[PDB]
Structures are given as C-alpha cells and as structure tokens.
C-alpha cells in the first residue's frame, strides 16, 4: 500500500542585501529606481496625502 | 477496408493481428481506431489492448506505451501481472517516475499489492 | 420445492438471525436456498442471511487451537485429543470432535440443529460408503485415497476411545460409525475464512448453520463476507445481477482447483466441471486461437468468457466441458501471429482425429457403456452417486469429443 | 423441544406510538448511519467517500439541490439498495398542515 506522499517545506534564514533590494526596488521605464525612501515624510501637513 | 463494405464481421484474430503491427511500427492513434471497432462489435478489448501495450514497449515507443495503458486502465480493465512488472521497471529505467508512480497507484486499485520489487524500481530514480 | 418447517427459521431467528428475501425449501435434497420476489440490478451488493458468530464452531487453522464461541470448558479432557492431532493434514478430525461436543453439552444451538442435518442414511460423502460401493467407481487413485481416508479415522478412534474413556469423552461416540458421520459433516460443510474478531485477524475453519444450505453451482452469484464490528457472517448478492422469483442462488465451493477428484471427494459429483479435463498427448499439437474463436470464447485462462452477444444464437452447445477442454489440450500458438495455417492435414482433421483415437470411446477400461446411464435404482444415498460420477465423467468425455469434432468440422464457416 | 419458542417471540403491542417519535427526531437516520458504518474499517475514509459522492451528485444535477441535501440523498441511495425503503433524501412532509409553519415546541 503506497501512501499518498506529500512533501511540503518551510525554510527561514537571514537575507542578503541584494535580496532586500530585489524585494523592494522598482525600476520605472525611465530608468529611475528610487527605492531608498530618502525622506521621513509620513503624511502631508496639508491634505492627508 | 473491404470487410465493412461487404458486411462480414471480422474475426477476433483479425483485429488482434493488425494491432500487433501498429504497435510494432509505432502507430499511436491507429491502434485506438481498431479499439473502437470491438467497442461496437461486442468484443472485449482486453486482449487487444494487452498485446498493443506490450508491443509498444517492445519497440522504443516509451511515451506511446504509457498513454495507451493509462487510457485503457483508467476505466475498468484488469491487466496481467507481467505487464505491471514490465512498465514499472521500464519507466523507471528511462527516468519516468511520474508515469511509473501513476501505474503503481493504478495497480493497487485493482487488487494487486505492490511488493518490494516495485518499490525497488521506484527507488532507483528517487535516489 | 415446498418450504421448510416453521421451526427451521426459528430457533436460529430467536438468536438474532435475519433472512430478508430468501426462504429455504424442504423437498428431498440439500435443503436449498431459493429466493422470493425480484431484486433488479443493484450497485454494490445486497446483504442477506445475517448469521452471528455465536452460532458457529470456528476452530483455528493453525496452532494454537482456539474456539471463539467457547465450547470446550477449562480443563475438559477433549482439548488433549485435539492438541494431539496432526496439524495441516486432517482439519476434519478436530472439527468432528467439536461437532460431537456440541451435541451433549447443554441446550446448545447445535443440539437442536442436528436434526436438520443429513443422517447416516442421507449424505453423499464417500467416507460413509462401503467396500464394494467404493469399488463401483471407474478410478483407482480415488479408490486408494478414499480407502486410506476411511482409515486414519478408525485409527483416530481407538487412540482416544479405548476402554478407559472418561464418561465425558465417552457417550460422544460409542461406535465408529457416528464419528464417521461427524467427520463427513466436517469435510462437507467446513469453510476456511479470515475472521477479524478484535485486533486479531486469523484464518479459521468454520461451520455455518443456515449458510451450508446454499447449494453449489460453478456459475455463482453469492459472496461470503464477515462484518468486522458486530461479528456477523453475511451472504451477498453479486452487483449487477438480476434475481428471479424462486430460482437457485448459489455460492461456489472450489474455484481454481477441480479435476473432479477432490470435488467428488467433498460431496456428490461434478456436473459441468469447468476446470477439469483428461490429458491427451498422443499427437503433436492443435491450434490455440481457433477453439475459442469458433465459439467466441474469451481467452485469459484465469477468466474465460463466452460473450453471449455472439451471433444469431449460433449454438446451444456451450457448457463447463467446452470452457474446460478449451484450455487443457495441446493448443499450439507459436508466434501468436501466424498465417493461421489452414493445413487440415496438420493443423486440423487427423490430429484431432488422433485425439478421437486417443479418446477411442472410453478405451482405458470400458467397464461399462451407455447401459449404465439411468439404471433407475435409487438407494443408500451413496450408491447411484458413484454411478453418477461415472455417468458425469463419461458425459464430459463424450461432450469433449463432440465439441472437438464440431470445431474440426467448422473451420471454414 | 426447548420450551421457549413463543414466550420469547410474543409480539410487543402498543408499539405504534413508539414508531413515530423515532421518525421526526432523526432516529431513523442515526440508526441507519451506524448500520452503514458497521462494516467500514476507517470512518474517515467512509466520510470522505460520502462527501465525494455528494459532490458528484451536486455537479451532475445542479439545479435540484438546496432542499434535498444531497448528502441525505446519497445516504438514502446507499440504504435503499438492500431493502430499507428510506424515502428519497429522507424528505419530511406535513400531511396535516393548512398553515405555513409548525411551532416546533
């Protein structure tokens, strides 16, 4: 009686900086990356945008 | 072609002879064409499908052999134990675990219980 | 075909036995199980003949011996008789001891069920026949085996009933002809099955009241099943099988083994015997894919079929003899894809004519001939039964010859 | 010979009222489920087989279920092949109801 094999997995480990960059950086067609999030601008003092 | 034109019902040996040739040469869909005939002439396809499956392995039509056996054995079609040993070993010889495992699962559905020989064949490619 | 007495269904019915669409008959034969009403085709199975475990004997098939409806008391001096019995050879002896014990212990169910069982004057088993009646049989190997088997039970009667015989052990068999009745009953009505009682899967030889009445036919329509939870044996109607309003419902005794020398040993005689034939030799070989082709017999020896959707009722000449002699004969096949050589000088005619010479109308001894059939004399319930066996073997040989000559005549349409 | 033939077989009367309260309380289904499970080895496999058969029933003839409770349908189908009349889908009626709804205690 061959049983219904079911192989699942769950790994965990520290990420390389390249992995984070590939996670977050989005390159526009113009060539800009701009994934750094330079300024700490939470929400405009103006309209909540 | 003249057998149906005249109206005489062909013999059991008649269909048996042709399917042996088509399997020997590698005819994939041609064998199924005859298989429909006995499905209308009140003739069982078990012997014809057994020899057709076995002949396709006697030539290097491994992909054809799995397709014909799986289609016929998906429904109710008991197979001789010799065929089960042949395809499980042959599929594992060329690295066809996906086809071999399905046949082994199909074999156990029809009563026959997998022994150490079948597990040994599977372990060859899983290793 | 008259129904059985009302007491037959009861006594067992009071002990939780339920039969739904059957009614046992009383006419002179094995009581017989014939149905009523119609069932129509079904999907999986229809359960019938609910038989509990308490109404059994079920001695185990291997050491140690255990009886789940406990009959032998603790320390009773009859377990020593059984434990001294040779295993794997004579399972019908300890079973006979259990049957004899279930006749004088208490108001046990078998104390009442004994009356419906066939008596010494009844029964067909050869263990109750005599010397000249065994001699009245066109067979010497069977004669030797049955003469030895009438012994080996005389021997296992004086080893445990010899002038010491505690009254418990005595009074069970005061003479060596009721022990023969018990031995014959054990031989005829024992069945070996698997019994899952609790966490124990075991193989055992069992005796089943109300189920042995199911007569025999090599074309069966009944299964034996053992319900694991409530410990009940049940007969099951086959899936996709229509049932008439009083026709026979049968369960096969032996399958995959026959030759009419062991079935006959176990009772009556073969009628169609789909697994027996006579060795031919004498010739070179006959073709294989024409004997099953003229009658449209399906191959695959383990499972032979006739395909009733054959022709415009081509013939009414198919039987167990045809399906048996279609696979026990030379049957040359060669490459299995030949030209089918219609060389009637070699592939047909003379070769089977040689078989006609080999079967030279009973050439072995021919102790008797057509005169024997229907001598019109019934007596002792064991005579006219060896005669019946001779009749059926002669009929099988004759019909095999007839089928062979029909085949050799019809090779051209 | 044994004098208990009819003393243990006399029919108990007054059973007609103890035939109905089984039928609206779900007693017939409860006593049929165990008889269907009397031969099964693993109950989970039996439950999964019943669920798959009910799924097939819903797929093949969709536009009937919503009232019939196809699980009840497959249970009745399995119980109806060995006698055991068991009306279709164990459907309950209101023989005496010139009104829309019972109070239900």
From Swiss-Prot, chain A:
Tree of life domain: Eukaryota
Subcellular location: Plastid, Chloroplast
Lineage summary: Eukaryota, Viridiplantae, Streptophyta, Embryophyta, Tracheophyta
Function: DNA-dependent RNA polymerase catalyzes the transcription of DNA into RNA using the four ribonucleoside triphosphates as substrates.
Family, as annotated: Belongs to the RNA polymerase beta' chain family. RpoC1 subfamily.
Oligomeric and partner information: In plastids the minimal PEP RNA polymerase catalytic core is composed of four subunits: alpha, beta, beta', and beta''. When a (nuclear-encoded) sigma factor is associated with the core the holoenzyme is formed, which can initiate transcription.
Protein name stated in the entry: DNA-directed RNA polymerase subunit beta'
